Amino acid sequence: GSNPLVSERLELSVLYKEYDNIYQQKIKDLHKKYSYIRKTRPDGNSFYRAFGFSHLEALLDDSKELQRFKAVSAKSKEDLVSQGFTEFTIEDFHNTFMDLIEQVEKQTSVADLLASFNDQSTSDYLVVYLRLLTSGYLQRESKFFEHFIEGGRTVKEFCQQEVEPMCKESDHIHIIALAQALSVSIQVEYMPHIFPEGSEPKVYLLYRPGHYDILYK
């Protein structure tokens, strides 16, 4: 498959061999802080799919962090429901999400985890729910995020147009919402923001116009 949802882990050497000489220096600037790269399909779902894999993959090496991620994720369904969401509409998305967490809990191989992220139904069900988490948090904290959204739309209308639908690529408002909703810190490199500010980043991403990839230290 020339266009997989989540690729294999690679070395960033394939960033030169994809490119423009002004760009050639900044990879060396990146090679001194990052050793490896994992790619997601540029479909407007890159951020959520990149985050989802990076964190779940990391939780294989931290049982105690997995338990609180599992606890937050389990409560999140009824949490969305209480704030206006239909349980029956989001049910199966949440269950697929919890299912991946259980696989990590039972120490699934990294290879098997990658396969699940390459199953269209499973991988997209995941992104759907991550978008619902993001949207749920945004509407919940509508007073805060209203300041950052231009007049003409409520936070809800913004969510139903920019966050909830698939194919809608993420920006800084998506990242902070998801990072706060799941309580995990995210750092984005471009081609260094920490979400939330003044925290220790557990997820490292690379951003190119309308696209996110996974970085590994």
Added chain:
Amino acid sequence: GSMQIFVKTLTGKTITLEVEPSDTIENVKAKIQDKEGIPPDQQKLLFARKQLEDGRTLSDYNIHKESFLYLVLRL
């Protein structure tokens, strides 16, 4: 710099600026740049959910001391 305002980013960071009541918006963006290293052409400033325009002053938007501007980056 005659009065004090605060600029808020999506990460949760609060930036303190010293400004003149008649400062243009791009002069505010300039102060943000030589303090956050962010090119003014990337900065989008909001006050009361309305985008502030280059050429207009803080007083044009009734922005007084200790006010909050909100910063969203374009890319």
